[PDB]
Amino acid sequence: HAPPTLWSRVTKFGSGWGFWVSPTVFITTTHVVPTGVKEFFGEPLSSIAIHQAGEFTQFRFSKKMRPDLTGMVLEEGCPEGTVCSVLIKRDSGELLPLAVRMGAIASMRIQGRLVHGQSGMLLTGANAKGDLGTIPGDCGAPYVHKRGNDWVVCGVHAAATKSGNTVVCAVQA
């Protein structure tokens, strides 16, 4: 199970969520980012290094924003067949992890936008029956997996079919 400190990195952002990889690095899905703003988390644009492509957005803040956190490994997707957890939070603070089996990393077009991403299949047998990943507010949620005693983040939720049975996370190139 993703531990409490890992969930504490999942942060409401724009029209979805993002995730603190370290005290200075925040990741999210590009389409959830607010536009026309002068700051993120109170920090001026001039103090943030932005790197975004293919629906993956990274912010690197000049100041330590979340010094409570260790830096963890961010990878460009994961090996095919990895089971990830998508760390979906809801507005109440309820935690709703979504288990997904990952498939190929590829560049694909979704609603006319380039997504550099990794597809995956919802695991019906590892999830409670109910709309995880299939509402706009769930985009940006991180895809994580445990490697040894360490958690790795490898993408951010970007897309899913109507049913939610097939998902895509954006990945950092």
Ligand SMILES: *[C@@H](O)[C@@H]1CCC(=O)NCCn2cc(nn2)C[C@H](NC(=O)OCc2ccccc2)C(=O)N[C@@H](CC2CCCCC2)C(=O)N1
């Ligand atoms: C977070 O903003 C959204 C999470 C997905 C979601 O809520 N899905 C349920 C509703 N829905 C959306 C779509 N269809 N149903 C459109 C699109 N999904 C899609 O194209 O699936 C087919 C598919 C094709 C190839 C590979 C995998 C699946 C989708 O999810 N769109 C996405 C917004 C776009 C915005 C512009 C950049 C890329 C994502 C979305 O609704 N995400």
